[PDB]
Amino acid sequence: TTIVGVKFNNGVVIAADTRSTQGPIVADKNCAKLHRISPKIWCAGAGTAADTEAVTQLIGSNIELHSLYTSREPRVVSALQMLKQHLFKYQGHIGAYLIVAGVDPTGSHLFSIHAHGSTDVGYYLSLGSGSLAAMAVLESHWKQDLTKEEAIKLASDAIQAGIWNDLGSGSNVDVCVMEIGKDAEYLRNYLTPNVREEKQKSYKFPRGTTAVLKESIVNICDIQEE
Amino acid sequence: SDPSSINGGIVVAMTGKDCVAIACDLRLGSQSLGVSNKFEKIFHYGHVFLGITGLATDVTTLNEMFRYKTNLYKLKEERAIEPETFTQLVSSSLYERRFGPYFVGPVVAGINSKSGKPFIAGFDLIGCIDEAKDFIVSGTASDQLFGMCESLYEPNLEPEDLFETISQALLNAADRDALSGWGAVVYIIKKDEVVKRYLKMRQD
Amino acid sequence: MDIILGIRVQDSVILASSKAVTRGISVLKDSDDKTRQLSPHTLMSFAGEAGDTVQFAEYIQANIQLYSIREDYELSPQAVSSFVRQELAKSIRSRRPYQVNVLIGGYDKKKNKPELYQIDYLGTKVELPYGAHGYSGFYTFSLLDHHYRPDMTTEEGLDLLKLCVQELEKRMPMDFKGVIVKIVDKDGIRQVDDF
Amino acid sequence: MDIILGIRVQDSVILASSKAVTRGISVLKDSDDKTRQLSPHTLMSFAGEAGDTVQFAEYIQANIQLYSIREDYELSPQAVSSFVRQELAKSIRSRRPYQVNVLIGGYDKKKNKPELYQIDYLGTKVELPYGAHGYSGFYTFSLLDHHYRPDMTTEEGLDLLKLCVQELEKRMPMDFKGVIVKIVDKDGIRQVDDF
Amino acid sequence: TSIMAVTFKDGVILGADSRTTTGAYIANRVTDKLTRVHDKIWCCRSGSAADTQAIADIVQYHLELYTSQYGTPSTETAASVFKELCYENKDNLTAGIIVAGYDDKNKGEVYTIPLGGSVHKLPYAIAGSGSTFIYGYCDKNFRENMSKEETVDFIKHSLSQAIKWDGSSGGVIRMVVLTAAGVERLIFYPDEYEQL
Amino acid sequence: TSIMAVTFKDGVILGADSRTTTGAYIANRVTDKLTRVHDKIWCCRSGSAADTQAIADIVQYHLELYTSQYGTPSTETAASVFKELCYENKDNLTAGIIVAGYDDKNKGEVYTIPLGGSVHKLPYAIAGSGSTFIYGYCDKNFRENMSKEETVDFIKHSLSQAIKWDGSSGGVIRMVVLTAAGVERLIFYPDEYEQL
Amino acid sequence: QFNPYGDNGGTILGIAGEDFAVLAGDTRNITDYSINSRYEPKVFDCGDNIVMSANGFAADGDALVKRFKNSVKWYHFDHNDKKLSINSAARNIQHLLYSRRFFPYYVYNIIAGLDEDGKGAVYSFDPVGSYQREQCRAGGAAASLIMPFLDNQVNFKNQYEPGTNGKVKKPLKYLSVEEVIKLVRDSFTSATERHIQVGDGLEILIVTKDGVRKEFYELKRD
Amino acid sequence: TTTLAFKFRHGVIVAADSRATAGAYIASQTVKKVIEINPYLLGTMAGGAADCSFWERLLARQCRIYELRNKERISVAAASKLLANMVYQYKGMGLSMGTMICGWDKRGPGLYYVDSEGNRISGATFSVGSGSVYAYGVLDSNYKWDLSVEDALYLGKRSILAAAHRDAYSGGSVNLYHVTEDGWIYHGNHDVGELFWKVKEEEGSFNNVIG
Amino acid sequence: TQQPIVTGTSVISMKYDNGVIIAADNLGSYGSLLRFNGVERLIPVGDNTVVGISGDISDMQHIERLLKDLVTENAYDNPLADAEEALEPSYIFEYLATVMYQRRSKMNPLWNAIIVAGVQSNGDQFLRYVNLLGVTYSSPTLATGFGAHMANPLLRKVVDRESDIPKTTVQVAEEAIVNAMRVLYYRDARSSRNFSLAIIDKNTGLTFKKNLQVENMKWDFAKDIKGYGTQKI
Ligand SMILES: *[C@@]([C])([C][O])[C@](*)(=O)[C]([C]C1=[C][C]=[C][C]=[C]1)[N]C(=O)[C]([C]C1=[C][N]C2=C1[C]=[C][C]=[C]2)[N]C(=O)[C]([C])[N]C(=O)C1=C([C])C2=C([C]1)[C]=[C][C]=[C]2
Ligand SMILES: [Mg+2]
Ligand SMILES: [Mg+2]
Ligand SMILES: [Mg+2]
Ligand SMILES: [Mg+2]
Ligand SMILES: [Mg+2]
Ligand SMILES: [Mg+2]
C-alpha cells in the first residue's frame, strides 16, 4: 500500500494506490483505499485491511450521530481523537495506520495516525510499504503555498513512485480533493497506467469439453401455491 | 496444525453476461487422509449463494448461522436478502470475532433481483471485502486458481461458455493440489433459473 | 481411547470399539465399553482423552434422555448428531475443550433407514456408509473401500468387520484387546456376545 | 527393539526375545531374530535404536570370530562379556554412542556352568541368574523373584518363561508379536521351534 | 529524542528537538514535543509517543476540570497527576515526562518523571535518548538565576550537542518560554545551531 | 571505565580513572588502566580486563621484537598490531583500546580501536562506559595545539564529569604525559577533582 | 544471527517441442518489497546447445551456472571436444547439487536443449539434485500459478472431445514454436498480474538444431 | 508416496505411485520411484527424492564394480547391505530414505527393506511411504505364495490404487515391475484417474464414489 | 557469524551518457551514536574505478586493504600496468564478489553492501552491486540500505530504462544524486550532512569531490506546526 496526504492553499488532498495483497499474491487489482468518515472528512488506510475499514465505519457512524446531536458539521479533530482513543485502547492489536484529512468550519486539516494511538500533524505525509518512495518525491517537490492543481500532481506523483518502486503497491491511483467552501470531489481511478495488454490467444473452450456426471434444477423460489 | 489447511478445499466464483457461476470441490480430509467425497461447500439463502472454504466445523457453523440470520431478515423485511446486503452481513459477522476468528474463506455469488446486475465478492477470515468484477477464489489451491482464472477468464461470457471456463479453472487447479479434489460441483446462476452440475474428475 | 469403527449396512448400523484402557505402560482394563445409549434407537461410541470422553458422552446422554421425557418422542439420529456437533463446536473455542471424537449410529424409525455420523472434537460432522476415528481408518478404509456394498446384510457387515479387525491386530503396534460390537436396527440396540 | 529376557538355570541359559520390528505406526516384521551367535557356546541378544543394534551386534560377532580363528580357542562367556562392556563404555563418550542394551548367555565349558550377563548401553555389566532390559523386567521380575531356583531344569525354566510372557501379553500396551526362545548349554545353541 | 527544561530568574524555559523515528527511518522531522496541559504548565514528552500523548491528553482533561472547580492548579499538582498515571500503569507504559510551569507565587518550577513513575523537583532537567551525551556539559554550564537570553543560549548549546551525537535526535530546536509576561514560542533551525 | 587521550602542542596525554567492577562491587579502586607497550607508546584499555591485558601483552611482545630488528616503531605501527588482533579475533574479544604515542617526526598521535577492530586516527579520543556523558563537554572544550597545563585541565575536567555520572567509573585520575622531554606520570585524587 | 540465504524472486518456464525447446524467465530481481534490477538476465546459454536457469537465491544460482559452464569446458578438454548430451548434463548437475547436500544451493534449476534423437528436452531439478525429464515445467515464485495452466494447454488435461461426454480424451497433438511462445507470454502476463515478484521483462531462449535464439518482451513494471 | 513389493512363487512384484509433493503443492505427477540398478535388481524410492536417487545410483555403480572384480552378479543381501552401511555413516545428519532392494539371485527371489534410520530387513511383503498403511490392507488380505503372474501384477496395482485414492500425497500413475530369474520386466505406466474408474466398474469397488 | 559494530549507511549511484556517478556520506555510526564524522567510504582504484561501501567499517577497512594490495600485485611483472593490462572495474568487482560469496559460504561474512562504479577500456559504463550474501545485480541506478528505498525512486525518474542513459547528461545526473543525498539527510537517522561524490567519465576521467554539504534545505514550514492534533498555541 502507498497512501499520501498533501495540504494546499485552500484545502487538502489525499491519494492512494489500488492494490491489495495476500503475501506475494495480489487479491484485488482495484481496491478502494480511500474511505469516507464524513462527507468532507476522508481517510486512507494501510496495514490490516479489515481493521482500517472497520475502524473507519465505526468512527464515521459515531461522527454522524455526533453531527446530528450537536447540529454542527463534523470536525477532523473529532475523528482524530475518537480514532486514537479507540486504537490506543486495543494496544496496536487493531493494525490500522491511517492518514486523515478534511475540511470543517475551523479550516483544512491533515493528520496521520498509527495503530498504537499516536498522531502527527503535517503539510505532507505518507504511509504504507511505499511510504519511503512517496516521501522521497514529497521531500523533493513539496513547497509552501501550493495550488490545488500543483497538489494533485504532487500527490499522484508520490503514489506513482510507490506503484513503480514498491512491490506491495500497484495498479491505479485514487484521489480525493477537499477544498474549503466546496463539496469534496472523489476521483476514483484518477490515473490508469497499468492496463493489461491484449492476450495472444483466446482460451474459450468448445462446448462439451468438460465431462459431466449429473444435472439438476436448483429450486431457489419459495414454496408455491395450489 | 494450520486450521485453514487441515480439511482442505476450494471455491471459485465468476461473473458472465447476465449470469454468475460458483463452484467447489467435494473433498473433506484430515490432513493426508481423505474422509468424505460429498462435503459440499456451497450453500444458498434464497437466491444468494455462499461458498465457504477452510476449517470444516466453521464452514458448517457459519452456514447454520447465515441461515439463521437470513430467515429472520426475511420475516422482518418481508423480502429475500440481496447479494450486496448479504455481503455486508458476512463481513460484519466475521469482524465481530476479530480476536477469535472463524478460519474460513467465504465467497458470495448472486444476481440482484431488482437491478439484474451480477455480483460476486470474497472475504478474508476477518471480514475484509474483495468486490471483484471478474472472479473470486478461495482455498488451499488459491494460488493455482488465481493463475487459471487470470489466464482463462474473459468478460461477458454466456452461461454455457462460462460453465466450461470455471469448470476447467477448478479441475486443473484441484489436480495440482493434494488437499483438493475428490469430486466437484458447479452452479450456473441466471436471474430466474439455477442449474447444478457434478463434474467427473480423477479420484486421487 | 484407541479404535472405534462404524459401518452402515442395509437395515442396521454396526459399531465396533476397542476394550483396552491404558495409563502409561499398564493396561488397567481389557473389557471397557466405550459407548452410551442416547436413545433406544441411537448409540454413540467415543474416543479421546481420559475423563473428557465419559464426561461428554454422559452429558449428551442426559440431554437426549431429558428431551425424550419432555416430548415423549425419540429424536431422529440426524437431530441428535446435529446437537452433538454444536456442543463440540461450542467446546473447541472454550477455555478447556472436550478432547473427544465420536461415532453416532442410529436407526431412523420414520424413514426406516440406518444412519451413521462421524464427528471429531472440532465439531466436524459427516454422514457416512462407514467411518473410523484416529489411526483406525488408516488400516481399515482400504478393505471397506473394496468390499462395501450398501445392500449388505448384517452378517456380511460383521464378516467385513472381522476382516478389518484382523488387519488391525496384524499391523497396529498397540494391543487394544479386541473389540465390543453392537448392532443398531429397527428392534433397538443389542450386543454381539461372541466376536 | 522392545523385550529381551534371560534366565540361567542349572545346566543352561535361556534367552527370550520379541519378534516385532516397528517403524512409527506400522509393524514391519513379526518374525525378527534379535540375536547373534558370538561363538558356539555364547549367544548375545540385543535391543535399542534401529541400526545401532545390528551394527554393534555384528561388529562384536566379527571380533569374537576373529579371536576364535587366531587362537583356535573359544573365549569364556566372562571374557566375551568384558570385551562387550569395554566397547560400550568406550562408545558412551564417543561422538555418536551405540544405543544398544544386550544380554550375553553362554556355557563355560571349562567350569561346566551356565552364565548370564546383563549389559546396558552405558557399559554397566552385572552377572545374574535372570535379567531383562527396558520395561520388560518391570513386569517379569516379581514372578522370577518368586518362582526361581538355581537347581531348575531347562523345562522348568521354559514354563517360568511362558508365565513371564503371559504376564507381558496381558499388561503391556504394545504388541511385541511373541518371542523367539533359544537355549545355550554344553551341546551348543538351539532354538525352541514351538512357543 | 532530546528534551530539557531550565528554570531562570524570570521563570522557566522548555526545550526539545523535533525528530521522531521508527527504527532508523525518520517518520516526522518537524515534531512538536512541547505540549500544553494548562495555560502556563507545559511538558516535554519522551518514550512511546502513543503513551505520552494519551497521558498528556488525560492530564489536560484533569487540569481543565480542576480549574473549573478550584481555580488555577500549581505546577506541583500537574506533576502529581502525571505521576499518578505513570506510576499506577508502569507495567503498560513507556513514558519519560518533564513537567514545567510558571506561578506568580512559586515562579518557575521543573519536575521530571522517569520510567518508574517517581517524581523529582529540580532546578533544571534533561531527558530522552540524547540527554546522555550532555550530562557533563549541562552540569558544568548551568547556573541559577540566569537571564532569559543566557538560558536560551544554554538550552540551544546543550540540545545542539545532543542532536550532534544522537541519531534519534535532530531537526529543529523548539523552545517555550514561561514567564509573567506570557507564553513565547521559539524555533531555531539547523543552519543556526549546527555552527555553534 | 572512563579513558581518553588528547594531543597537544608538545605531544600527547593519556588519561583514565581507576575503577574496576564486578557487577556493582568494586573489585579494585586503584587500577592502572594506562599501560605501556613501548617507551613512548601507551594505551588505555576498556572492555574485558582479561582480553585487553592479553592483547597488550602480545603487542608489547611484537613491538619489542620489532625494535630488536627494525628500530623504534611508529605509533601507527603499534595501532596496526592492536587492530590485527582485535579484528581477527573479534568473535572472541570484548576490547576497546585507545593507542597513543610520541615520535619526534610525527609528534603526538592518537588512534582509537572500538569493538569491531576498526582504526580511527584522531586529535583526541574518548572511550569506556563513562565517555558517553562527556561527548558534549569534550567537543565544546577541545582545541588543537593546547599547552601542557591546558590539556591536563581539559582531561581532568572531562574525566571528573565522567566519574560523576558513571557508576562504573571512579577512584583516582591517572595521567601519562608523552613528550620529547620524556614520560611523566600524574595522579589526581577525589578531593581535588570532585570540587571542580 | 547471520542468515546465509535470501530470496531474489523471479519465475522460470521450460517447454519441450518435437524438434525444439524453450526456456523462459522474467528479468526482475528483488529483495523483500524492493526492486534491485528490472533487467538482470536469469537464463544462460551454457554451450553445447544447452540453456540453463537456476531460480531462487541468486548468489547460489549464479554459482551453480558458473560451475556447470566450467564443467562443460572441462568435459571438452578431457574427452576430445565431445558434445555434452542433455541427459549427461542433467546427471552432472545432480552431482553438483548433492555435493552440497548439507549446505544446499537454494535454487530450482531447469535446463533445456535437444536429446540425441534431435527431439526437444526439458529437465527439472530440486535444490539437492533429484531430477526428471519433462515436457513442461514452471519453477520459482509463480510456479504454482503457471503449471496448472500448462497441464491444461500443453498436455490437454481434464479436456475431452465434445459429444462423447468424458468417454474420449482430447488427443495429444504436438505444439509449434509459435504456439508455445504464445503460451509462454500469456503465462508470464498472467503471473505478472497476480504475483508481485514477477514483472518488468521476459526473456525467452529458443533451442533448435540451428542454435540458440533469443526473444525479449516487456512486462508490467508495477 | 506409496511403494510396495512382495515375493511370490514366480519372483517379486514391485509397484509404486508417481506423485511428488512440495508441501500441499503437487510438484510433479510423472516421477519414477523405481530405480534400475541392474537387469536383475530394482530399488524403490520414498522420502527424500534426491537422497534416494543419489545413494541408489551410487549403489548401482558399487554393484557393477563388484561384478567386474568377482565375475559374478551381486546378491540381493549384499547389495542391500552396501546401501545400509553407506547411509549409516550419515545417521542423524538429516537423510530421509525408505527403500526396497528387490531382485533374483542364487537364493531365489529376494526382497530387503532399507531405511536411513538403520533398519535392514528381509521379508516377503513390504510397503513404504505415506500411503503404505492403506496398501497393506489389500496386500495382507489377498496375498498368497501360489499367485499367478497376472493376479500378482493386479494385486500390486490395486494396492497402490487404494492408497492413491485415500492418501493426498499419493497418486498420479502406477508403475509396475515384475522380477524374474531371467531379469526384471516393466509392466507399464497406468494413470490413476483412468484406472480408478475402470477398476470401479469392473470390480464394483469404491461404491461410495459416484461415476 | 558476527554482528556489525561501527557502520556506514547508504551508498548511491547512477549511470549517465558518458560515465557513472557514485556518492556516500562521511559518517561512521556506533548504533544510535553518531561516533565518527570523518570517514571516507568511497575508495578509488586506479583512475577508472570507485568502490563505494556500506555496512561494517572494520570489514570496509579490510576490503580497502585488499584493493590496495590488488593494485600492487597487478603491477608485478606487468609492463602494461598503467595501460592495456591495468585493472578494470569488472576485474575488481568479480574479485570482491568471489570473496564475499566465499566468506558467506564459511558462515563468516564481510558485513557489507558494495557498489563498484567505473568505466571500462572500451568506454562502456560499469555499475554493479554485491553484498554479504554474495548476491549480485546491475541496473542503471543502484543504491544500498536506505538509498534503495528513497534514492532509487528519484534516480529512476531520470533513468528509468537502458535507453534513457544516452539522454542523460553529467549535470542532470549529478543534480539528481545531490538531491537524493539531501532527501536521505532529511529521512535517514543514521546519515550526515557531509558527504563525498565521485564522477568517472570516459572523457574527463576520475573527479573525486570531498567535503560536500547538503544545502538548500527546507525547514521554515516547521514554525507553523504546533502540537500533535488539537493544540493551537
Ligand atoms: C510421497 C509423495 C510423500 O512421501 C513420496 O514419498 C515422494 C517420494 C518420491 C518423490 C519423488 C521421487 C522419488 C520419491 N516424496 C516426495 O514427493 C518428497 C516429499 C518430501 C520432501 N521432503 C521429504 C519428503 C518426504 C519425506 C521426507 C522428507 N519430495 C521431495 O523430496 C522433493 C520435492 N524435494 C523438495 O521438495 C525439496 C527439497 C529436497 C528441498 C527443498 C524442497 C528445499 C530446500 C532444500 C531441499
Ligand atoms: Mg491421493
Ligand atoms: Mg544393566
Ligand atoms: Mg542527529
Ligand atoms: Mg562514580
Ligand atoms: Mg509496485
Ligand atoms: Mg557400503
C-alpha cell at H158: 490395486
Q: Is H204 left (phi over 0), alpha (psi -120 to 50) or beta?
A: left
CB E193 within 8 A of CB E163: yes
Which residue bears the cell 553529467? I170
Which of A 2-61 lie inside 8 A of I, CB atoms? none
3-class state of residue H172 by DSSP = coil
Question: In this structure, which amino acid lies at residue F181?
Answer: A
C-alpha cell at F123: 586529535
Residue nearest to atom 36 of ligand 1 (CA): H22
Nearest to I116 by CA among I44, I167, I68: I44
* Phi/psi at F25 (5° precision): -80, 135
Nearest to C146 by CA among C133, C123, C163: C163
C-alpha cell at H85: 552401511
Tell me whether residue G89 is exposed, middle or buried, using C-beta atoms within 10 angstroms of its C-beta: 0 to 12, 13 to 18, 19 or more.
Answer: buried
CB-closest option in F116, F119, F132 to I5:
F116
Where are the domains positioned within chain C?
Answer: 1-195
Atom of ligand 1 nearest to the CA of H45: 14
- Greatest pairwise CA separation for chain F in angstroms: 49
Which of A 192-221 lie inside 8 A of H, CB atoms? 213-214
* Beta sheet of I205-213, edge-to-edge order: I141-143, I11-16, I19-25, I194-201, I205-213
Domain G1-222 fold is Glutamine Phosphoribosylpyrophosphate, subunit 1, domain 1 (3.60.20)
Measured distance CA(F30)–CA(F189) in Å, rounded: 11
Question: For F147, which DSSP code?
Answer: -
The preferred substitution site among H17, H21, H54, H173 for testing ligand 1, maximizing ligand atoms within 8 Å of CB, is: H21
C-alpha cell at A19: 492494490
Per the annotation, the verdict on A1 as an active-site residue is yes
Q: Taken in order A151, A154, A159, A160, is the CA torsion positive or negative?
A: positive
What was the elucidation method? X-ray
3-class state of residue A194 by DSSP = coil
Helix axes G143-153, G177-194, angle to 10 degrees: 150
Question: For I222, which DSSP code?
Answer: G
Residue nearest to atom 2 of ligand 1 (CA): H1
End-to-end CA, chain F: 20
Angle at G130 between CA G127 and CA G133, to 5 degrees: 115
- Residue H168's contacts (CB-CB under 8 Å, 6 or more residues apart) are B8, B29, B31, B32, B33, B34, B178, B179
Resolution, angstroms, 1 dp: 2.7
Tell me whether residue G160 is exposed, middle or buried, using C-beta atoms within 10 angstroms of its C-beta: 0 to 12, 13 to 18, 19 or more.
Answer: buried
3-class state of residue H20 by DSSP = strand
Q: Specify the DSSP element, H or E, that contains E196.
A: none
CB D46 within 8 A of CB D58: no
Chain breaks in chain D (C to N over 2.5 A) after: none
* Beta sheet of A185-191, edge-to-edge order: A124-127, A3-8, A11-17, A173-179, A185-191
Q: Specify the DSSP element, H or E, that contains A116.
A: none
CB H114 within 8 A of CB H107: no
Which chains border F (3 or more CB–CB pairs < 8 Å)? E, I
Cβ count near H21 (within 10 Å): 18
Per-residue HEC secondary structure of G5-40 comes to CCCCCCEEEEEECCCCEEEEEECCEEECCEEEECCC
Question: In this structure, which amino acid lies at residue A198?
Answer: E
3-class state of residue A180 by DSSP = coil
Class of the CATH-defined domain D1-195? alpha beta
C-alpha cell at F73: 616503531
Q: Specify the DSSP element, H or E, that contains C21.
A: strand C21-23
Where are the domains positioned within chain G?
Answer: 1-222
Domain I1-233 fold is Glutamine Phosphoribosylpyrophosphate, subunit 1, domain 1 (3.60.20)
3-class state of residue D7 by DSSP = strand
- Residue D33's contacts (CB-CB under 8 Å, 6 or more residues apart) are D17, D19, D180
Tell me whether residue I128 is exposed, middle or buried, using C-beta atoms within 10 angstroms of its C-beta: 0 to 12, 13 to 18, 19 or more.
Answer: buried
Does H169 sit in the ligand 1 pocket, CB within 6 Å?
Answer: yes
- Greatest pairwise CA separation for chain D in angstroms: 48
Whether I61 and chain F come into contact, CB under 8 Å, resolves to yes
Residue nearest to atom 1 of ligand 1 (CA): H1
Does H77 sit in the ligand 1 pocket, CB within 6 Å?
Answer: no
Which chains border G (3 or more CB–CB pairs < 8 Å)? A, B, H, I
* Phi/psi at D73 (5° precision): -155, 135
Q: How far is the CA of I85 from the centre of ligand 2 (A)?
A: 64
Question: In this structure, which amino acid lies at residue D52?
Answer: D
Which residue bears the cell 554412542? D97
Measured distance CA(C75)–CA(C64) in Å, rounded: 8
Where are the domains positioned within chain I?
Answer: 1-233
Cβ count near A53 (within 10 Å): 20
Alpha helices in chain G (DSSP H): 58-78, 86-98, 143-153, 177-194
Give the nearest chain F residue to E132 (CA atoms).
Answer: F133
Measured distance CA(G173)–CA(G18) in Å, rounded: 10
Measured distance CA(A75)–CA(B99) in Å, rounded: 31
Instruction: Tell me the shortest Cα–Cα distance from A202 to chain H, in angstroms.
Output: 27
Which chains border C (3 or more CB–CB pairs < 8 Å)? B, D, H
User: Which residues hold their Cβ within 5 A of ligand 5, which is an ion?
Assistant: F 163, 170
Measured distance CA(I127)–CA(G148) in Å, rounded: 39
End-to-end CA, chain H: 26
Bridge partners of D192, per DSSP, are D181
CB G180 within 8 A of CB G15: yes
Alpha helices in D5-149 (DSSP H): 52-71, 77-91, 136-147
Instruction: Tell me the shortest Cα–Cα distance from A85 to chain E, in angstroms.
Output: 8
Question: For A166, which DSSP code?
Answer: B
* Interstrand relation of G120-125 and D100-108 (parallel, antiparallel or unpaired): unpaired
CB E135 within 8 A of CB F165: yes
Measured distance CA(G36)–CA(G39) in Å, rounded: 9
Which residue bears the cell 546522555? E132
* Phi/psi at I222 (5° precision): -65, -30
3-class state of residue G170 by DSSP = coil
CB G126 within 8 A of CB G64: no
Question: In this structure, which amino acid lies at residue H5?
Answer: A
Bridge partners of A129, per DSSP, are none
Q: How far is the CA of A135 from the centre of ligand 7 (A)?
A: 64
CA quadruple C75, C77, C83, C84: dihedral, nearest 10: 140
Q: Is H188 left (phi over 0), alpha (psi -120 to 50) or beta?
A: left
Question: For E129, which DSSP code?
Answer: G
* Phi/psi at I88 (5° precision): -100, 155
Bridge partners of F75, per DSSP, are none
Angle at E66 between CA E63 and CA E72, to 5 degrees: 80
Q: How far is the CA of F23 from the centre of ligand 5 (A)?
A: 14
Question: For G105, which DSSP code?
Answer: -
Q: Is H24 annotated as a binding residue?
A: no
| CATH placement of domain E1-196 | 3.60.20.10
CB A159 within 8 A of CB A134: yes
CB-closest option in G94, G127, G144 to H25:
G144
Per-residue HEC secondary structure of A77-92 comes to HHHHHHHHHHHHHCCC
Nearest to I18 by CA among I116, I119, I93, I92: I119
CB-closest option in G124, G126, G134 to H50:
G126
Chain H meets chain D (3+ C-beta pairs below 8 A) = yes
Tell me whether residue E106 is exposed, middle or buried, using C-beta atoms within 10 angstroms of its C-beta: 0 to 12, 13 to 18, 19 or more.
Answer: exposed
CB-closest option in I1, I5, I28 to F115:
I5
CB F97 within 8 A of CB F60: no
Measured distance CA(I156)–CA(I172) in Å, rounded: 13
C-alpha cell at E59: 492530564
Within 8 A of I226 by CB-CB distance, chain E residues are 32, 185
Whether F104 and chain I come into contact, CB under 8 Å, resolves to no
Nearest to F32 by CA among F194, F185, F184: F185
Tell me whether residue G103 is exposed, middle or buried, using C-beta atoms within 10 angstroms of its C-beta: 0 to 12, 13 to 18, 19 or more.
Answer: exposed
Cβ count near D170 (within 10 Å): 12
Residue nearest to atom 24 of ligand 1 (CA): H47
Bridge partners of E139, per DSSP, are none
Measured distance CA(H155)–CA(H178) in Å, rounded: 12
Chain E meets chain I (3+ C-beta pairs below 8 A) = yes
CB-closest option in I149, I154, I221 to A140:
I154
Q: How far is the CA of F7 from the centre of ligand 5 (A)?
A: 26
Nearest to G72 by CA among G60, G86, G87, G89: G89
Per-position DSSP letters for chain B, written without gaps between them: --GGGSS--EEEEEEETTEEEEEEE--EEETTEEEES----EEEETTEEEEEEE-HHHHHHHHHHHHHHHHHHHHHHSSPPPHHHHHHHHHHHHHTTTTS---EEEEEEEE-TTT--EEEEEE-TT--EE--SSEEEEETTHHHHHHHHHHH--SS--HHHHHHHHHHHHHHHHTTBTTS-S-EEEEEEETTEEEEEEEP----
Q: How far is the CA of H82 from the centre of ligand 7 (A)?
A: 4
Q: Which residues of C touch B (CB under 8 A)?
A: 85, 88-89, 92-93, 118, 120, 122-128, 131, 137-138
Within 8 A of B29 by CB-CB distance, chain H residues are 168
Tell me whether residue H210 is exposed, middle or buried, using C-beta atoms within 10 angstroms of its C-beta: 0 to 12, 13 to 18, 19 or more.
Answer: middle
- Greatest pairwise CA separation for chain C in angstroms: 48
C-alpha cell at B166: 470455471
Nearest to G132 by CA among H53, H185, H46: H53
Q: Specify the DSSP element, H or E, that contains D161.
A: helix D154-171
Within 8 A of A213 by CB-CB distance, chain H residues are 210-211
Q: Which ligand is nearest to the CA of A163?
A: 6
Instruction: Tell me the shortest Cα–Cα distance from D173 to chain H, in angstroms.
Output: 21
Measured distance CA(B63)–CA(D9) in Å, rounded: 72
Beta-carbon separation of C175 and D173 below 8 A: yes
Whether H54 and chain G come into contact, CB under 8 Å, resolves to yes
Which residue bears the cell 533374483? H104
Measured distance CA(B38)–CA(B130) in Å, rounded: 28
Atom of ligand 1 nearest to the CA of H53: 13
Distances (CA, A) of B188 to A214, A217, B185, H72: 14, 10, 10, 68
Does H26 sit in the ligand 1 pocket, CB within 6 Å?
Answer: no
CB E136 within 8 A of CB F165: yes
3-class state of residue E78 by DSSP = helix
Where are the domains positioned within chain E?
Answer: 1-196
Angle at E45 between CA E42 and CA E50, to 5 degrees: 120
CB B189 within 8 A of CB B110: yes
Distances (CA, A) of G123 to E105, G93, H81, H84, I208: 89, 10, 32, 30, 51
Q: Which CATH superfamily is domain B1-204 in?
A: Aminohydrolase, N-terminal nucleophile (Ntn) domain (3.60.20.10)
Q: How far is the CA of H36 from the centre of ligand 5 (A)?
A: 79
Whether I5 and chain F come into contact, CB under 8 Å, resolves to yes
Measured distance CA(E40)–CA(I233) in Å, rounded: 11
Whether G178 and chain A come into contact, CB under 8 Å, resolves to no
Angle at I200 between CA I196 and CA I204, to 5 degrees: 115
Q: Specify the DSSP element, H or E, that contains A150.
A: helix A148-165
Whether F136 and chain E come into contact, CB under 8 Å, resolves to yes
Does H130 sit in the ligand 1 pocket, CB within 6 Å?
Answer: yes
C-alpha cell at E121: 523537583
CB I123 within 8 A of CB I135: no
CB C166 within 8 A of CB C87: no
Beta-carbon separation of A216 and B124 below 8 A: no
Domains identified in chain A and CATH numbers: 1-226 (3.60.20.10)
Question: For H29, which DSSP code?
Answer: S
Instruction: Tell me the shortest Cα–Cα distance from H9 to chain G, in angstroms.
Output: 34
Measured distance CA(E57)–CA(E61) in Å, rounded: 6
Measured distance CA(E36)–CA(I197) in Å, rounded: 45
Which residue bears the cell 473433498? B27
Nearest to F49 by CA among F36, F62, F35, F59: F35
C-alpha cell at A85: 482513543
Whether A91 and chain B come into contact, CB under 8 Å, resolves to no
CB H43 within 8 A of CB H59: yes
Distances (CA, A) of F97 to A131, F2, F65, F79: 42, 12, 21, 9
User: How long, in residues, is chain A?
Assistant: 226
Per-position DSSP letters for C27-94, written without gaps between them: EEES----EEEEETTEEEEEEESTTHHHHHHHHHHHHHHHHHHHHTSPPPHHHHHHHHHHHHHHHTTS
* Phi/psi at F187 (5° precision): -145, 140
Question: In this structure, which amino acid lies at residue E188?
Answer: F
Does H46 sit in the ligand 1 pocket, CB within 6 Å?
Answer: yes
Chain H meets chain E (3+ C-beta pairs below 8 A) = no
Nearest to G28 by CA among G212, G203, G204: G203
